[PDB]
Design a protein around this ligand. Structure first.
Ligand SMILES: [Mg+2]
Ligand SMILES: [Mg+2]
Ligand SMILES: [Mg+2]
Ligand SMILES: [Mg+2]
Ligand SMILES: [Zn+2]
Lengths: 52, 386, 225, 136
RNA sequence: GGGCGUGUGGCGUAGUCGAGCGCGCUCCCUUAGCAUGGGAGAGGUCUCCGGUUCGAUUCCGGACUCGUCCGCCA
RNA sequence: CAGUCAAGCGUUCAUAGCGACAUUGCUUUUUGAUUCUUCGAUGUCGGCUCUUCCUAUCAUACCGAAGCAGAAUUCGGUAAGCGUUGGAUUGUUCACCCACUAAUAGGGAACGUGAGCUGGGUUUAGACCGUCGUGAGACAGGUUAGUUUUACCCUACUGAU
RNA sequence: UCUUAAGGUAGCCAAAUGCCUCGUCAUCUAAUUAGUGACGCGCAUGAAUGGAUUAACGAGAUUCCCACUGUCCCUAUCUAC
């Protein structure tokens, strides 16, 4: 156990992201398009897979 | 089609072309980086390779299985008489690189250094630097204007030095002359050091000291024209091979329709200039001293010269550098010993080394004895001894 | 205690260490836990010497030790001999042995009073053992095992022998040594018990894989409680 | 060697390539060991994997007891007979090639070793040093 | 390597989605032999595993196994 | 060899990993198709040896994702800098086992490489068997024996004036 | 019973003769498309087209073992021309 607030603060940077389906890039959670050129700024995004 | 089995490339492409060196004295392509805080000192030295021997020392490596245990190692000996400073030169820096602008010589030049400026010394009027010494013996007029010119300009100061070949058992009589960089103080302090040290000798312990990692620059031993099997280490062809088997079978494909530069071929082997780095100094010996070969544990008064002398070289009556391992070049060759270009910690470059015993048996055979007193004590009296 | 210890992963402590009543010897290339076991259990009363015998980390199989004396092979250097002479107390005698079998821990199984040796040792070496150690000597094999030092662990209180040993050999050796002997295993069933562990009057040190019934057999036969 | 090594080993001059037959020094009933592999050996075109003293090899019993023949088992080289240099610079060699049988963890299948063993092998394998009579 | 088919009791073999016979032998009776015959026996995870069905040997998918057929160069 | 779509699988959950029914491509290490060049001749198998190149990356470097707790593993990115083995059988390429290893990745260079080798195979003339044929003879059916020529020229390359 | 007269007998075999085929089992080896011993619905064995066996012999073809070695690991050196 870390602490509940400290787990929230660490998960803000480590777990509450989104993943581009084409190029696996770690993206902002409210993003609409990937920031990478190689996937062509696609809008195929998924949430980052949580535990539990 | 593709090669059926992978294998590493034979030989090193960075040591190309494998041609004869331009001179018998290898060039120092780089000097240690200067900083203007240390006192004025040379960056390198010249000596003559004499030969190899063994030592026994107690190894100090905290963690090795041979910690605090005796090991026997091969060292090589470089005979180093004190070098004579004749001349300095300054280099300005241009957008096309470094460029010398003046050279100021010493006044009295010895015969062994002024033999370098001749191909037929025995039939000559010996007129060399005569009008230059006539430029000297005024008060200062044609001299410190060039010296103040080197002070005003010339971001790099190098000193022209020459060996004392007559102090060695070599039969050459013609000294070797070289430029050695100074790496201390300002430009004015460098040229003041050079001006004070004109016509003077510099000893090897003024530049080197024990447990120092240095570089050896020398031209390797020559071997003439050599086939590809020993020149490059390629695999010998099988026994039933028509038209010979010390060859390379395929020297290239159909396309590109040329022999490539990367294909191993026959030619000159050896006599290339090489720079070998990271050699530790074990002993800076003094020639004005008996018991050079003695240590604190052996303590028998014997010089570093073996029984019967060094094979093909002779005696070590001058100062010497005992350095660990093998250096390029054969015996009787000029070799330039250079300070390290970087600071190496490594827990091996910082090891303090104290020798226990130095081998002085004969290298002209299976020598049994270190000293003639020991040989006489073991064998008793002979017929020739009455 | 039979103390669980490893030599950097090795569960054979008798190979890398030699323990007597008066002194202890440990290899120079040892871990902090391995040194800390002997330092904590032995205390400051008994000297622990970090030593190398004949340039080898193995010291228990190279040397045979007693409270009165220590025996070292011929290949032991003068620096190691002088270091042992300085580090050891004045009571013990250190003497080089010039003998072909040359691995004295394997050859000799000994305690304070009585010793078992390899049958084929030389008579000068037997007299040297009887002189330096002050110990009466028998030439015997443990059920056909000539390496009595490797295949027996011996102390004053009792002894552990090889597991595959004939019972008749057990009472014969017990009557010959005047101590009770138990056939047993050490280090999860390893046969080499003397190489497996070291023991003295109040301490036994064994490998970590030595199981609880084996450790109980050790403390029972050596009376360490 | 590899897994069951107790420490490292300095380079010993390799004397036993693949196909070498050495004597079987222990009392396991095997007479000779035939080397088919060396643990930890590198890869070079046409180069035979060779063994030195103290190395662990893969071997088959060519001559011996039938329950030991016709299978591969690990072995440890204890006598080399090709001269090698130590760091104190003596060149030494035995008069025969000899090894013992072991598991992959290194403990001996047999119980006693006949003849000498090398100290570079006895330091590296403790079970060999345990069952060894004389260590040189 | 691929294609195509295949698989049932201890053995052989029949089955439309609603596991049976023979043989071997389990027993008993039968008999002047050159020893038979009669009556009741047991026996399957339908190759296996899923799905559909209400239930699949029976339908289907996958895997396994065996039999076939066709295949390299100069 | 790679896309796109997403019915399904994946306990639950299209897309962690997958993915039917479709459909768009790339490649020229497959095999065909064609017949352009060469029949006053470009030496047609495989192996050995040796250099270089490609990346559609097996390992090593640094990373992103997971049905990533650790350990082990899988998917993907920049990456060809660096390496990619020893053997039994077979003339083999291929294959299949034994074993080591960080790993035992795929390919090109006139299906690289015979005035570099070898000649086991194929592919002359001798000979045997089986099948076919009345026969002479035939058989990508099997077997055994069977001459591997020349550089001193130009260029290229390696060294030397 | 046909075909066409008679239908392969004694022996032998994945044989120099077996496509499938690197047939199946055993043995030989760490591993064997090789060898040997068996098996036989044998594409397409077989009896003076001679069948089977066979001591001795063979610059015949093939497999294994001992000895031996630069064939090889992995190359080095010397002499003459
Ligand atoms: Mg090729
Ligand atoms: Mg390749
Ligand atoms: Mg000599
Ligand atoms: Mg090869
Ligand atoms: Zn993206």
């Amino acid at each position: 156990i870390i602490e509940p607030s400290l787990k929230a603060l660490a998960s803000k940077y480590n777990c509450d992201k989104s993943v581009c389906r084409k190029c696996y890039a770690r993206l902002p959670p409210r993003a609409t398009n990937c920031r990478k050129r190689k996937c062509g700024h696609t809008n195929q995004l998924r949430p980052k897979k949580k535990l539990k | 089609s593709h090669r059926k089995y992978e294998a590493p490339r034979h030989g090193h492409l960075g040591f190309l072309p494998r041609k004869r060196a331009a001179s018998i004295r290898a060039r120092v392509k780089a000097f240690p980086k200067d900083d203007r805080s240390k006192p004025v000192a040379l960056t390198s030295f010249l000596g003559y390779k004499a030969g190899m021997t063994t030592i026994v020392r107690d190894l100090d490596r905290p963690g090795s299985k041979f910690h605090k245990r005796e090991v026997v190692e091969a060292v090589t000996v470089v005979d180093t008489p004190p070098v004579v400073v004749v001349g300095v030169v300054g280099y300005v820096e241009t957008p096309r690189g470094l460029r010398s602008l003046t050279t100021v010589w010493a006044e009295h030049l010895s015969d062994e250094v002024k033999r370098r400026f001749y191909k037929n010394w025995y039939k000559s009027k010996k007129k060399a630097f005569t009008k230059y010494s006539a430029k000297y013996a005024q008060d200062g007029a044609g001299i410190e204007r060039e010296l103040a010119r080197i002070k005003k300009y010339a971001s790099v100061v190098r000193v022209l030095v020459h060996t004392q070949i007559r102090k060695t058992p070599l039969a050459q009589k013609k000294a070797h002359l070289a430029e050695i960089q100074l790496n201390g103080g300002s430009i004015s302090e460098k040229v003041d050091w050079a001006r004070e040290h004109f016509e003077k000798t510099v000893a090897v312990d003024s530049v080197f000291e024990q447990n120092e990692m240095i570089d050896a620059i020398a031209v390797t031993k020559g071997h003439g024209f050599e086939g590809v099997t020993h020149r490059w280490g390629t695999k010998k062809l099988p026994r039933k091979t028509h038209r010979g088997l010390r060859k390379v079978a395929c020297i290239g494909a159909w396309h590109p329709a040329h022999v490539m530069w990367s294909v191993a071929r026959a030619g000159q082997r050896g006599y290339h200039s090489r720079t070998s780095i990271n050699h530790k100094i074990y002993r800076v010996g003094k020639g004005d001293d008996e018991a050079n070969g003695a240590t604190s544990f052996d303590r028998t008064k014997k010089t570093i010269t073996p029984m019967g002398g060094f094979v093909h070289y002779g005696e070590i009556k001058n100062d010497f550098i005992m350095v660990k391992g093998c250096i390029p070049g054969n015996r009787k060759r000029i070799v330039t010993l250079r300070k390290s270009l970087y600071t190496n910690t490594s827990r091996k470059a910082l090891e303090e080394v104290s020798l226990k015993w130095i081998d002085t048996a004969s290298k002209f055979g299976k020598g049994r004895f270190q000293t003639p007193a020991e040989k006489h004590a073991f064998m008793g009296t002979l017929k020739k001894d009455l | 205690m039979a103390t669980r210890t490893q030599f950097e992963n090795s569960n054979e402590i008798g190979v890398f260490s030699k323990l007597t009543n008066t002194y202890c010897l440990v290899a120079v290339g040892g871990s902090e836990n391995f040194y800390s076991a002997f330092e904590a259990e032995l205390g400051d009363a008994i000297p622990i010497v970090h030593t190398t015998i004949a340039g080898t980390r193995i010291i228990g199989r190279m040397t045979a030790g007693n409270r009165r004396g220590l025996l070292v092979p011929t290949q032991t250097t003068d620096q190691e001999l002088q270091h042992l002479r300085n580090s050891l107390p004045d009571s013990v005698k250190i003497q080089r042995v010039e003998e072909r079998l040359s691995a004295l821990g394997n050859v000799i199984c000994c305690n304070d009073y009585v010793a078992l040796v390899h049958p084929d040792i030389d008579r000068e070496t037997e007299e040297l053992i009887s002189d330096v150690l002050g110990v009466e000597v028998f030439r015997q094999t443990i059920s056909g095992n000539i390496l009595v030092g490797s295949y027996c662990s011996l102390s004053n209180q009792g002894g552990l022998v090889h597991p595959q040993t004939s019972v008749q050999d057990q009472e014969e050796l017990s009557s010959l040594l005047q101590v009770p002997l138990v056939a047993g295993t050490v280090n999860r069933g390893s046969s080499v018990v003397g190489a497996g562990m070291v023991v003295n009057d109040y301490l036994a040190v064994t490998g970590l894989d030595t199981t609880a019934p084996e450790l109980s057999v050790i403390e029972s036969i050596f009376r360490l409680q | 060697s590899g897994n069951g090594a107790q420490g490292t080993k300095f380079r010993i001059s390799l004397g036993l390539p693949v196909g070498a037959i050495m004597n079987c020094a222990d009392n396991s009933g095997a007479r000779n060991l035939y080397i088919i592999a060396v643990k930890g050996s590198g890869s070079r075109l046409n180069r035979l994997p060779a063994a030195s003293l103290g190395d662990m090899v893969m071997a088959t019993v060519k001559k011996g007891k039938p329950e030991l023949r016709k299978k591969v088992m690990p072995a440890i080289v204890v006598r080399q007979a090709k001269s090698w240099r130590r760091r104190d610079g003596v060149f030494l060699y035995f008069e025969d090639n000899a090894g013992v049988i072991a598991n992959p963890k290194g403990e001996m299948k047999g119980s006693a070793i006949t003849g000498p063993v090398g100290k570079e092998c006895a330091d590296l394998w403790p079970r060999v040093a345990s069952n060894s009579g004389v260590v040189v």
